Symmetry: C4
Subunit: 233 residues, 4 copies
C-alpha cells in the first residue's frame, strides 16, 4: 500500500516536471523563437529523463493514454490506472500553473495550448493524433516488454526519441499532443479549449490501437487455460 502511494506520487511529480519543462520550452520567446526540432527535443528529452529517473518506481507513464494502453496490456489494476490518470492530470495542471507563475506575462501568451495548426481539419487532426500515439505506444511496449529481457538496450532514450519523433510531425497539425494531460494543463490555466476533443480521442484511440496491435496481433502471448475449452469442444 505504501509502494502504491510512491508510484502515484511519482506519476504526479513526473507529469508535473514534464508539463513544466515542455510548455515552458514551447512558449513564444521573442529574441530567440524556438524551432520545431527544439520543441521536439524538449518534450523528447523530458520523457526520456523522467523514464530514467522514475521508471523503476512507477513505470513512468506521464501520459493518460499510456496508462489506458497499459490497462489493456500490462498487469495494472483498474484501481491503479485510475490513480495514475488522476495523478497525471493533477501533476500536469500543477506544472502549468507553476510555469505560469514563474513565466513573465509578456511571454506566456497561449501557454503552448494545443490548437489545430496549419488549417488542419478536426477529422484530419484526430487521425494524426491517432498515429502519433500509436507509434509511441508500440515503442513503449517494446521497450518495456519483460519478454524481451535486457535486449531493448535504451528504453528511456528510445521512448524519449519516440515522443520527439511525434513532435517532429505533430507540431504542424495540432502542436503535438500524444498526452491528454499535456493538453488539459494549459487549457485549464489559460482559457483555451479549441477543439479539445481531438487531443483526447486521438491519443486514446491511438493508444488502445497500439496496445491491441502489439499484445494480440504483433506479439501475442501463448494460449492460456482457454485451450482446455477447444479440447472439450
Amino acid at each position: 500500500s505504501i509502494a502504491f502511494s510512491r508510484a502515484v506520487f511519482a506519476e504526479f511529480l513526473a507529469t508535473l516536471l514534464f508539463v513544466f519543462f515542455g510548455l515552458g520550452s514551447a512558449l513564444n520567446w521573442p529574441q530567440a523563437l524556438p524551432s520545431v526540432l527544439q520543441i521536439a527535443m524538449a518534450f523528447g528529452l523530458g520523457i526520456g529523463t523522467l523514464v530514467q529517473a522514475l521508471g523503476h518506481i512507477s513505470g513512468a507513464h506521464i501520459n493518460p493514454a499510456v496508462t489506458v494502453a497499459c490497462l489493456v496490456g500490462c498487469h495494472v489494476s483498474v484501481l491503479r490506472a485510475a490513480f495514475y490518470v488522476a495523478a497525471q492530470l493533477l501533476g500536469a495542471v500543477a506544472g502549468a500553473a507553476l510555469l505560469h507563475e514563474i513565466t513573465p506575462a509578456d511571454i506566456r501568451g497561449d501557454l503552448a495550448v494545443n490548437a489545430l495548426s496549419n488549417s488542419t481539419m478536426a477529422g484530419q487532426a484526430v487521425t494524426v493524433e491517432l498515429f502519433l500515439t500509436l507509434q509511441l505506444v508500440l515503442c513503449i511496449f517494446a521497450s518495456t516488454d519483460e519478454r524481451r529481457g535486457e535486449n531493448p538496450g535504451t528504453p528511456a532514450l528510445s521512448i524519449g526519441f519516440s515522443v520527439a519523433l511525434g513532435h517532429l510531425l505533430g507540431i504542424h497539425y495540432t502542436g503535438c499532443s500524444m498526452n491528454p494531460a499535456r493538453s488539459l494543463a494549459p487549457a485549464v490555466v489559460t482559457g483555451k479549449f479549441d477543439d479539445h476533443w481531438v487531443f483526447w480521442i486521438g491519443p486514446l484511440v491511438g493508444a488502445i490501437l497500439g496496445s491491441l496491435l502489439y499484445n494480440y496481433v504483433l506479439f501475442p502471448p501463448a494460449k492460456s487455460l482457454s485451450e482446455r475449452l477447444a479440447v472439450l469442444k
Copy 2:
C-alpha cells in the same frame, strides 16, 4: 505459420508509420520551414523507433534495399525477402496516401518526393545514394552481428542515427532516398517520377556493396557445417 504472417505485417506497419512520419515532417512548411537537421532527425528517429518497436517481430527492415542486402547474410530466404519487399512497398504508399488525406491541400505540395536538387546530375546523384545506403547497410550488419562484441540486443538508435547521417548529406542532392519504397510512395500518390531510377539503382547497389564488403571482405561470418557444405559440394 503465424510467426511469418506477424513479421510481414510488421514490415508493412513499420513502413507505413515510417513514410507517414517521414514525408510529413518534410512537408508542413508554413512560417516554420523544416531544416536539414530537422528532417534528418525525423527520418532518423523514425527508423530507430520502428526498429525498437518491431525489430524483435520482423527484423525491422523498412527498406527494400536493406531487405535485398539481408538476402546475403541475414538468413532471410528469397521467399521472405519478396514478402518483405512487397509489404514495404504497400505500407509506404499507404502511409503517403494517409498523409495526403490528413494534410490540408495547400501544404501537401510535392509530398516530399525525392527529386534532383541543387542542379545535381543523375549520375552524380546515383553516386550519393549508393554511399548513403552503403554506410547504412554497413551499420546494420554490425549492429545485428553476434560477434560485434557486446551484450545481446540490437542498437536501434545507432541504426536510426545512421539513417539521419545519410540525410545530412543526401538531402542536398536528392532529398535523400536510401530506401526505394520511400521514393515510390510519394511518387505514386502525387505522380512525380522525375529521375525515379536514381532512387532505386542507388539504394539497391549501395546495399549489395555493403553486404558483399562486410560478409566477404571486412568481417566474414562463421559458417555452420551445413552452410560450409553448400559451398564445397557446390564446387566440382
Copy 3:
C-alpha cells in the same frame, strides 16, 4: 591503504579536469559568434553532450559530478564523507575558473563579450528565476541518482547519455530565464574572469536547493533504503 589513496587523488584530479573541459566547451559554444549565432538547441546540445561525454570519459574514476550541487546531493543522498565532497567542490570551482580563463585567452578579444555569464533574461525576476533553477537541478539529480543507484547495478543502462540529455533538457527551458546554470561552478567561472555578478546568488541558491530537494525526494520519498528485513 596506498591503493586507496591514489584512487582518491585520481578522483579529485578527474573532477578538476572535468569541470575545466565542461566550462571551456560550454561557454565557448554559447558565445555570440556573429557568423553563426548559437540557437537554444545548439547551446543545449553543447552543454548536454559535454556532460555526457565527460560522464562517459571520467565517470568510472570520480563519479563525474562536474557540479557542486550534485556533490552536495551525494552528501545528503549517496552518503559520502564530507572530506571527499569538500575536495570535489574545490576542484570544480578551480577547474571552472581555469576553463573560463583558458577560453578567454583562446578566443579573440572582440568576440569574448559577456563570456556566457549567467544573467537574468527576458525581464525575469530573481524570485521567478530562483524557482526555475530549482526545478532544473531537481530533475537532473533525479536522473543522476537513478542512473547511478547502487540497486540498479545489473544492467549498465545509459547513465552518460541520460544525464547528458537531462542537462540538455534543462537548457531547452533554462536558457530563456537565466541562460541555464544548474551548476554554481559554471556560473562562478565566467563571473570571476569577466566581472559580472548581477544576481549571482540566484545561480547559487537555486541549484543547491533543487539538488538537496531532489536528493531528499529520492532517498526518503521515492526510493528509500529498506528499513528492516522485510525486503532488505
Copy 4:
C-alpha cells in the same frame, strides 16, 4: 607475423574505407550552401553521427580510429604495434583524400567552393587556434579510451554514440575557431584536393598533441591498468 595475417589486412582496409566515408559525408554535409546553409549544430551532427556510425559499423574489425591522432593515442596506450600504427595512419590519409576527391566529383562546381577546408576563423590566431585543437582532441581521446574500456559496462550502441557525440561536442566549439579538425586526415584531404594549405600545421600539431596528452592522462594518471594479480583483490580490503 602481424603483417601477413588477414585480420591485419581487414583492419587496414576498414581504416581506409571508414576514413573514406567519414570525409565524404562530413565535408559534403558541411559544404552544400546554395539555398540551405548548414548550421553549426547541423555540421556538428554530421561529423558526430559520422564517427558514431562508423565506430558502430567497423569498430569490431579495426578499432575505428578514423584519425591519425587517435591511432597515435593508442600507440601510446592500446596495444597497437608501431607497424600497425603506421599502416593505420597511411590507410586513413589515403582514404581521406579518396573521400574528398570522390565528393568533389559528385558535388556541382557552383557549390564546391573551398571544399570545407579547415581554416582559421573569426580572426583567431594560430597560437590560439592550435590551443583549441589540443583540447578538442583531448576530450575525444578521453571519451574514446573510456568508451572502449573493458572495465566499463555499457549497453550495445551507446559507446559508439558517446564517441560520436564527443566529436559533435568538439564541432559545437571548434567550428568557430578552425572549422573543427580533431583529425589530421580530415584536414589534409580537402587541402590536397582544393590546394589550400593556410596554417596547415595547426590542424596537425593540435590534434596529435591533444591525443597523446589524452592517452597519457587516461592510461597513467586517471585510470591506469592494474599491476599485480592481487591489486583488485586488495582494493576490497576490510569491510
